[PDB]
Design an enzyme around this catalytic site. Structure first.
Site, PDB file in Angstrom:
ATOM      1  N   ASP A 538       8.145   0.382   6.414  1.00  0.00           N
ATOM      2  CA  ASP A 538       8.492   1.143   4.847  1.00  0.00           C
ATOM      3  C   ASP A 538       7.696   2.386   4.741  1.00  0.00           C
ATOM      4  O   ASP A 538       8.459   3.632   4.526  1.00  0.00           O
ATOM      5  CB  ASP A 538       7.963   0.321   3.839  1.00  0.00           C
ATOM      6  CG  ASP A 538       8.568  -1.099   3.638  1.00  0.00           C
ATOM      7  OD1 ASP A 538       9.264  -1.710   4.551  1.00  0.00           O
ATOM      8  OD2 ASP A 538       8.546  -1.653   2.365  1.00  0.00           O
ATOM      9  N   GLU A 735       1.216 -11.835   5.349  1.00  0.00           N
ATOM     10  CA  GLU A 735       2.176 -10.710   5.907  1.00  0.00           C
ATOM     11  C   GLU A 735       1.575  -9.939   6.707  1.00  0.00           C
ATOM     12  O   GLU A 735       2.367  -9.446   7.830  1.00  0.00           O
ATOM     13  CB  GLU A 735       2.539  -9.935   4.429  1.00  0.00           C
ATOM     14  CG  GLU A 735       3.823  -9.312   4.393  1.00  0.00           C
ATOM     15  CD  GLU A 735       3.955  -8.683   3.016  1.00  0.00           C
ATOM     16  OE1 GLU A 735       3.533  -9.045   1.998  1.00  0.00           O
ATOM     17  OE2 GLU A 735       5.078  -7.830   3.296  1.00  0.00           O
TER      18      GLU A 735
END
Ligand SMILES: OC[C@@H]1[C@@H](O)[C@H](O)[C@@H](O)CN1CCc1ccc(CCNc2cc(Cl)cc(-c3cccnn3)c2)cc1
Length: 765
Positions: A538, A735
């Site tokens: 990202d 994550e």
């Protein structure tokens, strides 16, 4: 024979607990059909149950943890749920029983055990909610013998085209049923299992919580109307017990109240099969499932040193079971901007502002419906298909069950449009949309995502070249079957390849740009000043400002991956003309990675941009991007460039933390800046690829064999121990992992590519 295996697969996989977005529920892989879901909550007051009730997955201070202990979508599995708020440890065992022509039967046991801190006389409301969508289908609750509710089991009889005739029984269960001495018991009974049968338009049946509450609120209004008041009020649990009214409908609510520990069964009996399913059937098939689960794991995921111990085995089973346990069936319309606004071409300087303007036209509309059968990253936070994630998810899954993996690949590729586009994020239907703000639902046909599904394909291919047990490997054991699958997918593989080259093309020719090939150059569409969402990484720092002259070395590497897969698959199918075209593309990429992306100064790969003076400038940010040709298995084992990448990877002051490789170097100016998503933390998926490539170099004659062996050994160790240690301490897969502290951070329940850890422990790539 291919046709036959296909049918056997369909029958095998039809039923499952394929609603991972909720704690526990079932649906078949049919868009409009029979769905079930579980709800429970303690009741201590007149107003608390609305806050305590559980249904859709979440993760907060009220929930210790939950997940699958064992699971195989052909057989079933066991889930445990540790609920602090409701003082309950819950087990949900699900099991499938093959037979008939309609996808077989299934059973589940729901067991709730109060924990030590719960009041021994806790009242817990439990609801089993059953809905059925479809025009020509029926479902009826068989009425009680008794006046106010059911003393024994609840029988639902139903029928549809998809399922034929079936019955669904919710058994009496074990546990204290509280009894009310209040006046109200003359009208509502002293307390017993109740059923309400109702009808709503099909498209809202999924809204189980509001449907339940509307019914509870009508019960309370009736109390108020019939003079039950605060001078002498019935107990809470009786106030919240629906008035029994079974019948015909497309919604059936089955409610029980229990005091203390409780358990009950759900028995789905497919009429076309033998005799109906019993609780004794359930217990036996659960026992058998566990046995089979154990035997398979030990063969498929045989953990190598130093993870051979039972602590790591338990860890492996949990990480694996949560990943395969996440498998869902999703169905519905998606939100897509089909304007193909010219601003989305991103050809001018400042394109991001133009692209924003097109978005603010809001031409997106619903289309479909689509279906998808996929695993997911995150039950609590994003229980839906993400395109490059699935490539990682399927790697351990394919080990377990290659036919299942191919089924999921097939499912994804059936989404692909005429141009070769699959949305990178699959939000199917109103239920799935409920988890996503409207601003983030719209998909864009110019937005790619890494084609990691090819990695899975590559593994199938290598395996191909060299009854549930049978079905699981039928596509490798029958090479005829394997090839037919490939024959049929190959065109969409090619289509996607062409789509990348058409829509994600970088610009060599229009600048002072010299390279071996005039064609091979790539630039991810969709970037904004701070982000490049389509690459998967990202906020990894990219050329500033974004520029139509950008080239991205990760994108070119992904194209390399695809072309190599195409070579092997084309070759297998004899697609001679294609394999010649592919070969020349690979050669060109190999050269152009070098000409356009290699920094001799920096000793690594860099993305590229165009300067203020319009010249090709390298933009170097040492990190995952920097390693891409290596990560994607593109470099030769004797490449001097590879050797320098090995130096960067091993280098503590840059990428190498005790916890794994850092996403961005500590030396990079953007280290730990902004939201710091990909600007320092350790991500298991990219570490997984490093580990795999190190092992490849380590088990071949070459100059770096021994450096590679050392790095492989240590990285494997660091990544596994980090994920293990956090799992031990928190019960969660995370994550990403903090490179200073080793702590898991961002979201929990990330299973999710963090589950790659079971293959890392397994080894022998
Ligand atoms: O794995 C899939 C993708 C990858 O493909 C991408 O490459 C990668 O960049 C990102 N990945 C995930 C994308 C993503 C991230 C985040 C959200 C919003 C979730 N909302 C939410 C709500 C609540 Cl109530 C609490 C919390 C919460 C709690 C504790 C800690 N942190 N958060 C979060 C959606 C989607």
């Amino acid at each position: 024979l291919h046709s036959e295996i296909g049918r056997l697969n369909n029958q095998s996989l039809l039923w499952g607990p394929y609603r991972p977005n909720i704690y526990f529920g079932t649906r078949p892989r049919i868009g409009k059909s029979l769905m079930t879901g579980l709800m429970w909550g303690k009741i201590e007051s007149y107003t608390d149950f609305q806050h305590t009730v559980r249904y859709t997955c979440e993760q907060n201070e009220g929930m210790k943890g939950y997940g699958w202990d064992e699971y195989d979508p052909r057989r079933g599995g066991i889930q445990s749920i540790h609920d602090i708020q409701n003082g309950l440890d819950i087990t949900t065992s699900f099991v499938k029983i093959p037979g008939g022509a309609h996808g077989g039967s299934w059973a589940a046991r729901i067991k709730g055990t109060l924990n030590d801190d719960a009041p021994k006389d806790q009242k817990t409301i439990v609801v089993f909610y059953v809905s059925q969508e479809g025009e020509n289908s029926e479902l009826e609750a068989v009425p009680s013998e008794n006046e106010f509710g059911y003393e024994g089991d609840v029988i639902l009889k139903g029928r549809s085209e998809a399922l034929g005739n079936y019955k669904l029984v919710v058994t009496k269960g074990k546990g204290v049923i509280p009894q009310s001495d209040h006046d109200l018991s003359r009208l509502r009974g002293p307390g017993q299992t109740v059923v309400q049968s109702l009808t709503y338009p099909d498209e809202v049946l999924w809204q189980a919580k509001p449907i339940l509450f509307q019914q509870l609120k009508a019960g309370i209004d009736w109390l108020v109307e019939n003079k039950y008041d605060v001078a002498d009020p019935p107990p809470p649990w009786q106030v919240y017990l629906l008035a029994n009214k079974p019948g015909s409908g497309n919604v059936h609510i089955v409610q029980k109240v229990f005091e203390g520990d409780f358990e009950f069964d759900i028995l789905f009996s497919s009429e076309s099969a033998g005799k109906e399913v019993t609780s004794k059937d359930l217990e036996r098939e659960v026992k058998q499932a566990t046995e089979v689960f154990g035997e398979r794991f030990a063969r498929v995921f045989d953990l190598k040193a130093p993870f051979q111990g039972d602590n790591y085995k338990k860890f492996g089973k949990s990480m694996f079971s949560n990943l395969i346990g996440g498998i869902g069936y999703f169905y519905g319309h998606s939100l897509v901007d089909r304007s193909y606004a010219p601003e989305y071409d991103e050809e001018n300087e400042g394109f991001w502002e133009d692209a924003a303007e097109a978005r603010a036209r809001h031409q997106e509309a619903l289309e479909g419906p689509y279906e998808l059968f996929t695993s997911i990253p995150s039950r609590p936070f994003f229980p839906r298909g993400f395109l490059w994630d699935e490539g990682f998810h399927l790697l351990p899954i394919a080990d377990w069950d290659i036919d299942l993996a191919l089924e999921i690949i097939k499912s994804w590729y059936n989404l692909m449009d005429e141009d070769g586009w699959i949305a990178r994020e699959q939000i199917l239907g109103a239920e799935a949309r409920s988890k996503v703000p409207k601003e983030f639902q719209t998909q864009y046909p110019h937005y790619a995502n890494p084609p990691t599904l090819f990695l899975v394909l590559d593994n199938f291919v290598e395996r191909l070249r060299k009854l549930d047990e049978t079905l699981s490997t039928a596509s490798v054991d029958n090479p005829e079957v394997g090839l037919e699958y490939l024959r049929r997918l190959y065109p969409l593989l090619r289509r996607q390849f062409d789509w990348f080259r058409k829509t994600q093309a970088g610009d060599i020719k229009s600048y002072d740009r010299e390279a071996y090939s005039t064609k091979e150059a790539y630039r991810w569409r969709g970037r904004t000043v701070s982000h490049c969402l389509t690459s998967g990484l990202d906020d990894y720092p990219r050329p500033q400002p974004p520029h139509p002259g950008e080239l991205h070395v990760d994108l070119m590497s992904w194209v390399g991956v695809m072309v190599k897969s195409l070579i092997s698959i084309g070759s297998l199918l004899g697609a001679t003309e294609d394999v010649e075209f592919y070969t020349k593309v690979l050669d060109a990429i190999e050269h152009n990675l070098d000409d356009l992306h290699w920094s001799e100064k920096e000793g690594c790969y860099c993305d590229a941009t165009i300067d203020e003076f319009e010249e090709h400038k390298l933009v170097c940010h040492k990190g995952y991007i920097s390693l891409f040709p290596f990560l994607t298995g593109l470099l030769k084992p004797d490449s001097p460039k590879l050797g320098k990448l090995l130096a960067l990877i091993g280098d503590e002051s840059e990428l190498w933390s005790p916890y794994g490789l850092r996403s961005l170097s500590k030396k990079d100016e953007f280290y730990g800046t902004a939201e710091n998503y990909w600007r320092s933390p350790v991500w298991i998926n990219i570490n997984y690829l490093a580990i795999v490539q190190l092992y490849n170099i380590a088990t071949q004659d070459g100059p770096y064999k021994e450096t590679a062996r050392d790095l492989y050994t240590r990285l494997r160790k660091n990544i596994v121990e980090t994920v293990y240690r956090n799992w031990e301490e928190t019960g969660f897969a995370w994550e990403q992992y903090n490179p200073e502290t080793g702590k898991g951070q961002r979201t929990q329940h990330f299973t999710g590519w963090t589950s790659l850890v079971v293959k890392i422990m397994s080894g022998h790539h």
